[PDB]
Amino acid sequence: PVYVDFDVPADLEDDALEALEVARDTGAVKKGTNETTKSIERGSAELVFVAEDVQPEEIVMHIPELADEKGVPFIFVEQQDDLGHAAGLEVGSAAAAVTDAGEADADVEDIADKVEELR
RNA sequence: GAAGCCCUCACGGGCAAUGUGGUGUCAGGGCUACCUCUCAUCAGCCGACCGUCUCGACGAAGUCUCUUGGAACAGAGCGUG
Ligand SMILES: [Sr+2]
């Protein structure tokens, strides 16, 4: 909420999670705020997800600005456990990063595009 | 970066991407590229001597004479470990 600066429509979040699921099956994805953080720093990240029900918020507060000064596009998910399920985890995930999609590159592109428009 | 931990005989359950586990800890470390090599460390297995304290077993040689005395464990004489 303090790091969130725009609401994402359930529909968009839907497409993003699906795109993320086919990303792990095909391409490569990072699970965890730390791994997600290094990817954004090493530049090996295409799309990073960030849960919105993260408490404490400090764990993810840095993702937004870090992503901006790195061109890396990012999107919010209303729930932490979905992101983890989608990321293929048996647990939750405060943040996620698609380290190069996989037969989803097309979708990822649009989502990023759609997001930028959503400001 | 799930390669992990806990409970249960098992089935199964719980924990864990807000990081279990690997690596590492100033002879700094890590990574990339090399040489060599380990007996350092950490973990676990086995597992005492001796010594000290206490307890216990075993363990030599007179119960001879006279006198005094209620009593010899005394005096005098002979004898022993
Ligand atoms: Sr959780």
Task: Sum up the structure in keywords.
part of a larger assembly; 1 chains; 60s Ribosomal Protein L30, Chain: A; 5 helices; 4 strands; 44% helix; globular; binds strontium ion; RNA-binding
Q: What can you see in these coordinates?
A:
With 119 residues, the protein is of the alpha+beta class. It has one domain (1-119): 60s Ribosomal Protein L30, Chain: A. Helix content is 44%, strand content 13%. A four-stranded mixed β-sheet has the order 1-4-2-3, with helices on both faces. It is globular. Bound molecules: strontium ion. Residues 91-92 line the site of strontium ion (SR). The chain binds one RNA strand of 81 nucleotides through helix 2. It is classed as ribosome. The entry lists the keywords ribosome 50S, protein-protein complex, RNA-RNA complex, protein-RNA complex, peptidyl transferase reaction, ribosome.
Overview in brief:
The chain has 119 residues and is an alpha+beta fold.
Tell me the number of strands.
4
Largest β sheet strand count, sense and barrel closure: 4 strands, mixed
CATH architecture term? 2-Layer Sandwich
Rg measurement, Å: 12 Å
PDB class: ribosome
Keywords: ribosome 50S, protein-protein complex, RNA-RNA complex, peptidyl transferase reaction, ribosome
Entry title: The structure of CCDA-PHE-CAP-BIO and the antibiotic sparsomycin bound to the large ribosomal subunit of haloarcula marismortui
Name: 50S ribosomal protein L7AE
